[PDB]
C-alpha cells in the first residue's frame, strides 16, 4: 500500500478537510499547490534557498497561531512581496489576533528582508469536506 | 544546532574552504602550466601540502540541507530524496506534480 | 545558518510568543523521566 499523503478510513466519525483528504496524485489534477513562487520554472535559480524558508513559515505560524490554524497556509510571492494568506478559526479574542499580525508581519519583514502582509480569514469551525 | 554533529563537521569544511579559497586559487594557478620550469613549480607544490585539510573543496561531501543524508540528494531543491518527497505530496513546492507521462 | 533559525526559535519560546509542540513534548516527558530515572 502507498501511504504518502492520505488519511486512512477508520470509522464514520473522523472529519477531514478538502486538502488532506486528497491523495498526492491529485496535486494539480484536483488540488492547488500550497505555495506559489518563481523557482521551479526552468531555467530559474533561487528555487533552492526559498523552499527552506518556505518550510519555516508554515512551521513558524503553526506555533505562533497555536491551536487555531484551520488548515495549511498559502504563501504567495509577488516580486519582492511575500503574501501570506491564512484561514484561522474563530476561537480567539480579536485583540489577540491583531497583535500577532503586526508581530509576525514585522518579524517576517525583518527576516526575509522583504515586506510581508498577512490576510487572515475567520471560519467558525474546521471546514470538513469528507466525513470519512 | 545543526541536526547532527555531522553537519557541523561539514560546515567547517565550507567556511574553511572559503577563506582559504583565494590562496588555493592563486597557488594552484602556479602549477597547471607548461611554462615557468619545474623548480619554480615544485616549491609551490609543497606549500599546498602544508596548507591543511578541511580547506580543499574535495573534502566536502555534498549533503542534504535539513536531515543531513550524504547521498540521495537533489541539488536543485537542496534536500534529500525523502524529505523533499515529504513536501511534494502535501503540495508544498511550486509546481511539483506526479509525472504520469 | 541553523543557529539563526534554531536559536531565534529558542528565545521565541522563552518570551513565549511561539509555542512549539516538539520541545513541549520533551520538557513534559523529561519531567516524567526525572521523577524516576535519573
Amino acid at each position: 500500500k502507498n501511504r504518502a499523503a492520505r488519511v486512512r478510513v477508520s470509522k464514520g466519525d473522523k472529519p477531514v478537510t478538502y486538502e488532506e483528504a486528497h491523495a498526492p496524485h491529485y496535486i494539480a489534477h484536483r488540488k492547488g499547490w500550497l505555495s506559489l513562487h518563481t523557482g521551479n520554472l526552468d531555467g530559474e535559480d533561487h528555487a533552492a534557498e526559498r523552499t527552506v524558508e518556505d518550510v519555516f513559515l508554515r512551521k513558524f505560524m503553526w506555533g505562533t497561531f497555536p491551536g487555531c490554524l484551520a488548515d495549511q497556509l498559502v504563501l504567495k510571492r509577488r516580486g519582492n512581496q511575500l503574501e501570506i494568506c491564512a484561514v484561522v478559526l474563530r476561537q480567539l479574542s480579536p485583540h489577540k489576533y491583531y497583535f500577532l499580525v503586526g508581530y509576525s508581519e514585522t518579524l517576517l519583514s525583518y527576516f526575509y528582508k522583504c515586506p510581508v502582509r498577512l490576510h487572515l480569514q475567520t471560519v467558525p469551525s474546521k471546514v470538513v469536506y469528507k466525513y470519512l | 544546532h545543526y541536526v547532527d554533529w555531522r553537519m557541523w563537521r561539514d560546515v567547517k569544511r565550507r567556511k574553511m574552504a572559503y577563506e582559504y579559497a583565494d590562496e588555493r586559487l592563486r597557488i594552484n594557478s602556479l602549477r597547471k602550466n607548461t611554462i615557468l620550469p619545474k623548480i619554480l613549480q615544485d616549491v609551490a607544490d609543497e606549500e599546498i601540502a602544508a596548507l591543511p585539510r578541511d580547506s580543499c573543496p574535495v573534502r566536502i561531501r555534498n549533503r542534504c540541507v535539513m536531515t543531513s543524508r550524504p547521498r540521495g540528494v537533489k541539488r536543485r531543491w537542496r534536500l534529500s530524496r525523502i524529505v523533499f518527497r515529504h513536501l511534494a505530496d502535501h503540495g508544498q513546492l511550486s509546481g511539483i506534480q506526479r509525472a504520469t507521462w | 545558518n541553523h543557529h539563526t533559525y534554531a536559536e531565534l526559535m529558542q528565545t521565541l519560546r522563552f518570551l513565549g510568543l511561539y509555542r512549539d509542540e516538539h520541545q513541549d513534548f520533551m520538557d513534559e516527558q523529561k519531567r516524567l523521566k526525572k521523577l524516576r530515572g535519573k
Binding site: 527552506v52 518550510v55 519555516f56 512551521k59 503553526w62 | 544546532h1 545543526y2 541536526v3 535539513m66 536531515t67 | 541553523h2 533559525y5 534554531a6 526559535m9 512549539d20 509542540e21 516538539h22 520541545q23 513541549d24 513534548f25
Partner: peptide, 20 residues
C-alpha cells in the same frame, strides 16, 4: 536543529503506537 522539530499529532502517534 529547528528543521528536525515537528508537530504534536505526529509525535503522539509515534509514541502511543496504536497500530501494529
Amino acid at each position: 536543529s529547528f528543521f528536525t522539530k515537528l508537530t504534536a499529532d505526529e509525535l503522539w502517534k509515534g509514541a502511543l503506537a496504536e497500530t501494529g
